[PDB]
Design a protein around this ligand. Structure first.
Ligand SMILES: OC[C@@H]1O[C@@H](OC[C@@H]2O[C@@H](O)[C@H](O)[C@H]2O)[C@H](O)[C@H]1O
Length: 359
């Protein structure tokens, strides 16, 4: 069988710091191998690292094959890891190089630094590549200037790195931006992807997927979005935008995700698209406060969102991956909840079939 539920990837030592683990991310390589990483809250020193686990049987079993370490700052690689495989060469880094981006942060949380590291041997060894974005104190409070949450994607001859940015702290509590590169060393000026005029709004957590009508869907949580539910005065509903040019979401109309039964997903979303289910494929979205997946088989039409149960539990920024040799297969991977986590977080995954789940 290719499907499985709740297979454990990592059970953290008892001495790891709340939340112990968080922010799981998967990656499929062109040879079918899977890589996985997460925020790894070990007792320091040594400075924290991003572990790299590898599966050769479609995620049934896993083994750690390396650690991505901060070799530049004597801080550690601490938050918001993101794995990505180059689909083409950039500068001296050929097609098939594995990138691991993430934020390097000293233990005292006084600064944030989004880095790119590269592996030329499919995840066994790593080398620093470049510093992308420096920010201030790593607490999500209005007025601080941190940067967070890198997400990578290619577009033609460019690689784009999307992230969350609090540096414009006289105008936006947080906004969403990107930089681009053609060689993985020189990065463009910051470009805005999504921002709202009320200072207290905090759009965050960008992820992106390519649709088969040559548009891209750009998904994020809209901190401070309208109509918080009774008894809340600030929430993080999931919104998205559509654009033929993925450098230009800023000027595109936004849409909230709401399923046909009225469910409003919120918190730390993650989107993928898979060439399965019909001529438009299937867009799949997870959010960080519910266990279901949300699907759209109409290229992001706002009235076509569906919702389906899966056996993988709710988790912060629960992530998604679709298998290139079988688009019907969906991996859902998580590393538990935001602290306080009560010592309960583990890193785990399920593989489901959209054909079975979508009934
Ligand atoms: O990833 C660990 C997590 O990051 C910090 O918050 C960042 C905050 O999270 C999103 O919801 C927003 O885009 C961003 O400002 C937390 O302090 C830490 O637990």
């Amino acid at each position: 069988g290719k499907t499985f539920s709740n297979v454990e990837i990592f059970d953290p030592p008892t001495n790891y710091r709340d939340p112990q683990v968080l922010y799981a991310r998967p990656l499929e390589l062109s040879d079918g191998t899977l890589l996985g990483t997460w925020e790894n809250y070990s007792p320091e020193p040594p400075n924290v690292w991003f572990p790299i686990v590898k599966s050769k049987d479609g995620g049934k079993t896993w083994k750690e094959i390396s650690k991505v370490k901060d070799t530049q700052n004597n801080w550690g690689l601490r938050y918001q890891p993101q794995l990505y495989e180059l689909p083409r060469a950039f500068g001296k880094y050929p097609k098939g190089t594995v990138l691991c981006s993430g934020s390097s942060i000293p233990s005292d949380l006084s600064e944030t630094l989004i880095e790119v590291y590269a592996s030329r041997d499919k995840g066994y060894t790593w080398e620093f590549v470049s510093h992308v974005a420096l920010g201030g104190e790593a607490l999500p409070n209005p007025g601080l200037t941190p940067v967070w949450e890198p997400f990578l994607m290619t577009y033609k001859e460019k690689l784009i790195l999307y992230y969350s940015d609090q540096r414009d702290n006289a105008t936006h509590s947080q906004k969403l931006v990107h930089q681009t590169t053609t060689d993985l060393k020189k990065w463009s000026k910051v470009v805005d992807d999504t921002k709202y005029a009320d200072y207290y709004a905090r759009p965050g957590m960008p992820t992106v997927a390519k649709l088969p009508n040559n548009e891209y869907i750009y998904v994020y949580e809209y901190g401070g979005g309208p109509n918080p539910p009774a008894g809340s005065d600030y929430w993080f509903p999931v919104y998205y935008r559509l654009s033929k040019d993925p450098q230009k979401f800023l000027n595109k109309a936004h849409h909230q995700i709401v399923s046909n039964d009225g469910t409003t997903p919120a918190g730390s979303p993650y989107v993928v698209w898979t060439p399965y289910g019909g001529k438009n494929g299937t867009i799949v979205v997870s959010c960080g406060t519910r266990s279901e997946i949300f699907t759209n088989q109409a290229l992001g039409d706002a009235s076509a969102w569906k919702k389906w149960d899966v056996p993988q539990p709710t988790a912060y920024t629960r992530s998604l991956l679709t298998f290139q040799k079988d688009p019907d297969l969906l991996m859902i991977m998580g590393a538990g909840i935001l602290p306080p986590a009560g010592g309960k977080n583990t890193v785990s995954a399920s593989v489901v079939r959209l054909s079975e789940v979508m009934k």
